[model samples]
Target: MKTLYDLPIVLRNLPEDLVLEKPLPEVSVTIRAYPEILNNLTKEQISLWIDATGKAVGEHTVKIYWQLPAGIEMVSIPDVTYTLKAKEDPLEHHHHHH
Candidate 1:
């Protein structure tokens, strides 16, 4: 049987396109279409999938994997990952955090 591949994941730092040198800590993932699944997923599960999907192609939903540094309570938008189409405008679809 043939297998279907999910979306691709892209990681980047805040306020810039700089990709993180290493994977984020406390990584979490979520499929927007399926919220319940997200609630049930553990950090290890999400991290594994993210690592695997990051190697593939396409767009997918993801949640923050890292926490703010000490003293900083939270980030405007949790550091997350998202997939983009190969043909989509690069600049048009991007993640930004304040």
Candidate 2:
């Protein structure tokens, strides 16, 4: 028989020049697999994150990103909303060409 497990999901891939106004939310992802795999599975072995790449500095609501194992299947997941802000001053200086 297969068993179900709930693992916490984390955030990743935020732009280097961007900062967060507040902390990220806490969410969990439910996975279904056999008892053997579920028993041996750990959070470190799981690859799950919320990608914020190419996202502008503002508020955004995106879905969870995950790469499940061979025998694992995702049962459910919740959405997350994040607010990204720009750093004090970007290094890039724009030169006006007239």
Candidate 3:
């Protein structure tokens, strides 16, 4: 699937984007969307998908994915508003204090 990413991640409304050297599990991926199946007669929760490969620090539109079987009355999540960013640098310590 050209539209599908080999690996997918979800964040719980984390408005900002990723760190420059952002770790997927840390400061990036709140939860993985892959291999996740939500059971339902008629209901759902939410997860966010983002492109970790993108470079920019601003609001953008991105795709959402549901790993359910094809056309099983699945409610495909809509395109979401997200802010893409590189994680900020950590605090540097000055060891050479006079």
In order, candidate lDDTs are: 0.40, 0.69, 0.43
Clashing pairs in 2: none
lDDT (Cα) of model 2:
0.69
Candidate 1 lDDT, 12-73, residue by residue in tens: 33323333333434443333334565455454533322343333444444643543222323
Candidate 3 lDDT by residue in tens digits, 1-98: 37433234554434353532232332232222333343332223433355535335766666645443333444344455544565553654456553
Comparing 1 with 2 on TM-score, the higher-scoring candidate is 2
Q: At residue 22, what lDDT does model 3 achieve?
A: 35
The order of the candidates by TM-score, greatest first, is 2, 3, 1
Q: How far in Å is the alpha carbon of 95 misplaced in model 2?
A: 12
Model 1's alpha-carbon lDDT is 0.40
Looking at model 1, the pairs that clash are 8-58, 27-65, 59-83
Model 3, global lDDT: 0.43
Q: In candidate 2, what are the lDDT values of residues 1-98, reduced to their tens digit?
A: 54332225555786767877766666555666798877887868767677777777888787666675667777876677877878866455667642
